[PDB]
Amino acid sequence: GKRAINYQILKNKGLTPKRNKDNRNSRVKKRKKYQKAQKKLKSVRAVYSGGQSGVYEGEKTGIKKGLTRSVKFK
Amino acid sequence: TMQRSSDVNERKLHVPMVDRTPEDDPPPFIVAVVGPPGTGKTTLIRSLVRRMTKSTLNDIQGPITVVSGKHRRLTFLECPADDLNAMIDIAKIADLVLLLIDGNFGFEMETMEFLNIAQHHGMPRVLGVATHLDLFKSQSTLRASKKRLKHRFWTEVYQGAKLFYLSGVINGRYPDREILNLSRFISVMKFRPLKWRNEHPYMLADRFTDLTHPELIETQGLQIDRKVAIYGYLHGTPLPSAPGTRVHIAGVGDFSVAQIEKLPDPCPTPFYQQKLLIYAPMSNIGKLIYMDNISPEECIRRWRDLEKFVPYFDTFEKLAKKWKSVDAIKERFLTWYELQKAKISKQLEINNIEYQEMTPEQRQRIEGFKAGSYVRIVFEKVPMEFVKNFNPKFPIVMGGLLPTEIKFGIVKARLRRHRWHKKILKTNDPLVLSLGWRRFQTLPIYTTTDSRTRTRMLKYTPEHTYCNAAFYGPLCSPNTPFCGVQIVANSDTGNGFRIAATGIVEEIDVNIEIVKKLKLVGFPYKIFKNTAFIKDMFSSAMEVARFEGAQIKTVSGIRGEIKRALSKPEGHYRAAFEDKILMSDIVILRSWYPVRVKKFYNPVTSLLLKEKTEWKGLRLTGQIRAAMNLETPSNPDSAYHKIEKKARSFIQKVLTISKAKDSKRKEQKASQRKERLKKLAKMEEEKSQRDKEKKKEYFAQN
Amino acid sequence: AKLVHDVQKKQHRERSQLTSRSRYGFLEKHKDYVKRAQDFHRKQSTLKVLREKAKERNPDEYYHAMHS
Amino acid sequence: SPFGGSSHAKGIVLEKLGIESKQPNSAIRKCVRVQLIKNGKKVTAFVPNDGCLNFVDENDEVLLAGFGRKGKAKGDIPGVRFKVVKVSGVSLLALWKEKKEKPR
Amino acid sequence: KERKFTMKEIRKDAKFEARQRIEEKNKESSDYHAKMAHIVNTINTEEGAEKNKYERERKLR
Amino acid sequence: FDRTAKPVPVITSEVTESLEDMIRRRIQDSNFDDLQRR
Numbered sequence A: 001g002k003r004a005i006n007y008q009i010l011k012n013k014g015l016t017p018k019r020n021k022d023n024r025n026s027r028v029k030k031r032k033k034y035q036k037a038q039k040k041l042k043s044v045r046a047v048y049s050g051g052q053s054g055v056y057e058g059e060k061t062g063i064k065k066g067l068t069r070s071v072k073f074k
Numbered sequence B: 001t002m003q004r005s006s007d008v009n010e011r012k013l014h015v016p017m018v019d020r021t022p023e024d025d026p027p028p029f030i031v032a033v034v035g036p037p038g039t040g041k042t043t044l045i046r047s048l049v050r051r052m053t054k055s056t057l058n059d060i061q062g063p064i065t066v067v068s069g070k071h072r073r074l075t076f077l078e079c080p081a082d083d084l085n086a087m088i089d090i091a092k093i094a095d096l097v098l099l100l101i102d103g104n105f106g107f108e109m110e111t112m113e114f115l116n117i118a119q120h121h122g123m124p125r126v127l128g129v130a131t132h133l134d135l136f137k138s139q140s141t142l143r144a145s146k147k148r149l150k151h152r153f154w155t156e157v158y159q160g161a162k163l164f165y166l167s168g169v170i171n172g173r174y175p176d177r178e179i180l181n182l183s184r185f186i187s188v189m190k191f192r193p194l195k196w197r198n199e200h201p202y203m204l205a206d207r208f209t210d211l212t213h214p215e216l217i218e219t220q221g222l223q224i225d226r227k228v229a230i231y232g233y234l235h236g237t238p239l240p241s242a243p244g245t246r247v248h249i250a251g252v253g254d255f256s257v258a259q260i261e262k263l264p265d266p267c268p269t270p271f272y273q274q275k276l277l278i279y280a281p282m283s284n285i286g287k288l289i290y291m292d293n294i295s296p297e298e299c300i301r302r303w304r305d306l307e308k309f310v311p312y313f314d315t316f317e318k319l320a321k322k323w324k325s326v327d328a329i330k331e332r333f334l335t336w337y338e339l340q341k342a343k344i345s346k347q348l349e350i351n352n353i354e355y356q357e358m359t360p361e362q363r364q365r366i367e368g369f370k371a372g373s374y375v376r377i378v379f380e381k382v383p384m385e386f387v388k389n390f391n392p393k394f395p396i397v398m399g400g401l402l403p404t405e406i407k408f409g410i411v412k413a414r415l416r417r418h419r420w421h422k423k424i425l426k427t428n429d430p431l432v433l434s435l436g437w438r439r440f441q442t443l444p445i446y447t448t449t450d451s452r453t454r455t456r457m458l459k460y461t462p463e464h465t466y467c468n469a470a471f472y473g474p475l476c477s478p479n480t481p482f483c484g485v486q487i488v489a490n491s492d493t494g495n496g497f498r499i500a501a502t503g504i505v506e507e508i509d510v511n512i513e514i515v516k517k518l519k520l521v522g523f524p525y526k527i528f529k530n531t532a533f534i535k536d537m538f539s540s541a542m543e544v545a546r547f548e549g550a551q552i553k554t555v556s557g558i559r560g561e562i563k564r565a566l567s568k569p570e571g572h573y574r575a576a577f578e579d580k581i582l583m584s585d586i587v588i589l590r591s592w593y594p595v596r597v598k599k600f601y602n603p604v605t606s607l608l609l610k611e612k613t614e615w616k617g618l619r620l621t622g623q624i625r626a627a628m629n630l631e632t633p634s635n636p637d638s639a640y641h642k643i644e645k646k647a648r649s650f651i652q653k654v655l656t657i658s659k660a661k662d663s664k665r666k667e668q669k670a671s672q673r674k675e676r677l678k679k680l681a682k683m684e685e686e687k688s689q690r691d692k693e694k695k696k697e698y699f700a701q702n
Numbered sequence C: 001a002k003l004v005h006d007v008q009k010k011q012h013r014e015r016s017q018l019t020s021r022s023r024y025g026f027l028e029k030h031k032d033y034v035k036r037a038q039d040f041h042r043k044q045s046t047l048k049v050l051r052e053k054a055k056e057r058n059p060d061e062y063y064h065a066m067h068s
Numbered sequence D: 001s002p003f004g005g006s007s008h009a010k011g012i013v014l015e016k017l018g019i020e021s022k023q024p025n026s027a028i029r030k031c032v033r034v035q036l037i038k039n040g041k042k043v044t045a046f047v048p049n050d051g052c053l054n055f056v057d058e059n060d061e062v063l064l065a066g067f068g069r070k071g072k073a074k075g076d077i078p079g080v081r082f083k084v085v086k087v088s089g090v091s092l093l094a095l096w097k098e099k100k101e102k103p104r
Numbered sequence E: 001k002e003r004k005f006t007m008k009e010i011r012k013d014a015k016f017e018a019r020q021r022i023e024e025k026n027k028e029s030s031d032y033h034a035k036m037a038h039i040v041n042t043i044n045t046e047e048g049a050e051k052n053k054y055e056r057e058r059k060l061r
Numbered sequence F: 001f002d003r004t005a006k007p008v009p010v011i012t013s014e015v016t017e018s019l020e021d022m023i024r025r026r027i028q029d030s031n032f033d034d035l036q037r038r
């Protein structure tokens, strides 16, 4: 029959936004920012990803005729 | 470091306040040992009296007044750790609080409630005593518990407060080194002024006698409202000596004083003023004017009709002839904070320098027993149960009343659910208030100004911010804090908090207008273009004829007035709108019915029960509903809801997949194109304002 | 979000249609109203522009396509 | 520098300027009339968040600081140079996020 | 005839108190706009004077 | 409650007195704003 104090009165926090388990450990947030930005620049360049892994199944995602991604000399 | 030299001398400048603690007979500064049940209090009291007067005290009860040091003394009080009905007024009366925590348990909610009550009602000098360090040999864990308790305590009270730690008890008394280094601190105390204890004459009772006739009580038979002498010790502002003063002692309600009397002081002054120690109880022309008998003109002829305003005069010719020459009247004719402190201190100094005069006027009939005078008070008509079941454990505080705080009526305060109370406060659910000296259960009504035009009734308090509130009760002065408790009985406390509503009274009145938005509601049944006959919101054409001209709006957001009653289908009527409504709409008025506050008022009347606690006042609405087991009145249409050939067949399937996939891809690209457009709008607006700042900074060199 | 709480920007759910009028159900709130009203305004405007051309029909028009 | 040399000045609030502004959380609602103590003068301070305006009532020994707008707002008034940062001992940011408690 | 009398009288009452409270509401709204505008531009100008004075004193040095 | 528009302005002897002294002051000025032969 002896009282106690609960968690929020012991910690004395409250009325904060919902923060992030990714935001807790800085090594993790500087990992889940990189491997997103690692997968981001599969959309501005076309980076090397090992090469011909299986047998050559074709280029598998579309080749278009009227497009030249070659920087030209003015 | 001139910036630091001009920045650290802003710690001095505060609000100028006045003290009224005179330097001739200062009262014993009431300190108040309070905390959890079980640990601490009585052994700490025994140790402090054993180190301050070299004599023990077994079976202590009630308030002691011990002496410490040369000039001034102090007063202890073992407050019981089971009732807010003692905890609240102890926090209202106290000046220092040595506050007990036990380090093998963490904090506790009784000292939590005490610290919140002190924080609202006016901060005394708090000083933490962490006892019960039987923790372990692991001095790492001892340092850990002391560090975490110190950081939590410095967050709860001012950061930097003293937290004296005590070890185990050596045969009844505490370690005397720690009692030494605590007693030196409370000898170098240095208190501060507070507005309540510098505006109200307040006294702690330490002796309590019933000078009512034994033959009279034996011939009346345990029925009388007796007469009672409180032998006590007043603090604060001077309790005015003329009998007839309204004085509220706590937990029974107010009375008027019958006669008061100054006693021999039972505590030391300095011995030079003695010539030229624990006390532990419960264990001409002025009299010519003010003489009642004589008439005023007989008074002035012994010395030597004001509706007529004009001053008196003699014969016009007489004083004109006297003042044909008027040379008899030729003798008449011909920083900021230290400034404010000098102003009020020079006021107090000239007050004292014309107080230091003849004793019957200037001590007990012009200002009346200033501060620090052991006085007996008597009250007749004090009820029976007070003296029948008086307990020496409980404190008896008593504060006088200003002329404004005996009247009754409504009062409009601001309120807020205390942020650790686990449940919010429904309106018309009664609660106990420590508004000033009186503590009372009353029914509030929580209102808010909807953007400051009218005061409508909320059905609930807001969840974390303030709101206005109005309730019947004793009309205290404006701008004062007050706490509000829920149920006070210790049969229902469990594991939850007890303080519910902190707040501040700012405004009193005698009648409040306060509305509640009821919405008249009807349905359309013959919908035209631009007008509609609406149905079964008014029972008669007389009601429609009163309400002709009103703005209504549907649930779709279209306005429209109503015009005239229809004739034959007597309930129905005709209204004009923005454009054509659907049939599945609801027309809505807007209307305000003035609700009135309930005139309930019941003080706690705490120290009259046999039990001294367990004062069940009015129960909450939820628990009387659970007591007579009615369900909570849900409304079934009000609950929310979560609203809302092979080759040819194959080619048709492929096309009807692909066109819908590309359709929603296109609409998603358009949706995000809208946000890219808004982002570019913000960027161009910021860039344009930056460049129009730069183009005039380029020209301000002219 | 500058200086607000999440409890200050909690969600307001919308109330249903009453069961007493559930035969012609689906109470119709403000977004559905504006999606009705702008559509009706557009239909009225195209009706009035073809009515205006009808009131100025100019009864002597002729093209090669009007032989059948 | 804006008041002698100090960066902060204790002050006494006269009255909540603009309680009758109907639009909630507006510039003319979020002002107080602070009596600066260091030279005994009037100034108009700018307490943030009208929901936490109502901590300070009257002579709450408030502690001011500068404001320093980092751009241009929609309906902000100019002239207010001072914001409230601490009231009666505690910081009203901590009060508005309800960690501490205002003492009286 | 009494029904016609009471309906005519209550609608005359409605039109009368309609007119008086609506001119009262517009009058108090206009005076509120006047008071609010007055305090906002006096707090604008009287403080902007010393704001520009302190900015002139700072930008020199 | 609240209402949309001001009601019909009822014609009282005070408002016809103000209209009559308006028009009689106006034609005492003879400031009637008619057309002209132009």
Ligand SMILES: Nc1nc2c(ncn2[C@@H]2O[C@H](COP(=O)(O)OP(=O)(O)OP(=O)(O)O)[C@@H](O)[C@H]2O)c(=O)[nH]1
Pocket: B036, B037, B038, B039, B040, B041, B042, B043, B044, B081, B131, B132, B133, B134, B166, B167, B168, B169
């Ligand atoms: N080991 C140890 N025991 C303690 C310590 N402090 C108090 N106690 C024990 O607690 C018991 C209760 O003593 P008190 O604290 O004086 O009791 P109280 O103050 O009257 O508290 P209540 O009975 O609830 O009113 C004592 O008999 C002690 O044995 C401590 O620091 N160490």
Ligand SMILES: [Mg+2]
Pocket: B041, B042, B078
């Ligand atoms: Mg005890």
